[PDB]
Amino acid sequence: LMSFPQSAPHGVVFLHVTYVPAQEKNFTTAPAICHDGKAHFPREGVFVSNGTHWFVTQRNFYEPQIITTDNTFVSGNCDVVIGIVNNTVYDPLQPE
Amino acid sequence: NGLTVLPPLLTDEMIAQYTSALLAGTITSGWTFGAGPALQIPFPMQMAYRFNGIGVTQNVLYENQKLIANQFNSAIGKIQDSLSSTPSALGKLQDVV
Structure with missing residues (x-):
């Protein structure tokens, strides 16, 4: 995400702020969806x-x-x- | 005459195990095993993520997965044949030794 520098004797200290995922869950995945005879991709x-x-x-x-x-x-x-x-x-157009 | 060579700390078996672990993580988790927990993901979806990252839509892969797998297998075979035939492929390590 971002890093903050810090002064040090004869050196430098970086405070690396990183994004670490956690609490994962298993789900069933599919490469495409077939609704109107044609494939759909995200x-x-x-x-x-x-x-x-x-x-x-x-x-x-x-x-x-x-x-x-x-x-x-x-x-x-x-x-x-x-x-x-x-x-x-x-399809958002049909109900509207 | 005093010249003694010391063995390395990590043996060849440990390096092979590290390489196998890296390969398994890459083929079963994509890039998530390095940034955090190993999130399982199918390989035909990791390839789709790679194609989306290089600027190609995922439908290309979802339509030519067979051709891409055949090309990958042929490339691996050609690499193995080149390593078996060409002796100067690993010339850097031999030159260092």
Whole structure:
């Protein structure tokens, strides 16, 4: 994150402030989601599954969010990606 | 005549174990084993993270994983064949000795 210098006799001492993750949990992951016949890939994050539902969260922190159209992009069909799962993709335009 | 060579502290077995541990951490945790706890992650997702880091979308890997694995295997085989055939590959260590 950042470092603070400190003076020392014939030297220098750095106070390196680092980000160390902790309290990790296991989750089921999938490379892509197939809802409208085409595959979906996260722009920033990774798919996670708590056993019953699927969510999208960042890599360095657990923040489960609904799989919306704004968080993923469409590229190719579903019969190419190995390990793709079937899950619905929320579209913000339909309810509005 | 007094010239005596001392053996190193870490033997070849310990260096091999360290190398195997580094390799296992790299293939099972990506870059998280060095920054903190070893977070397990599939290799076809570590490769996707690497591609996203080099500026390539992850769909390229998710569509050409087979070709990329074949190219990696062929490259490893060619490296092994070059190390087996070319004797001057490790010339620096031999020159030091």
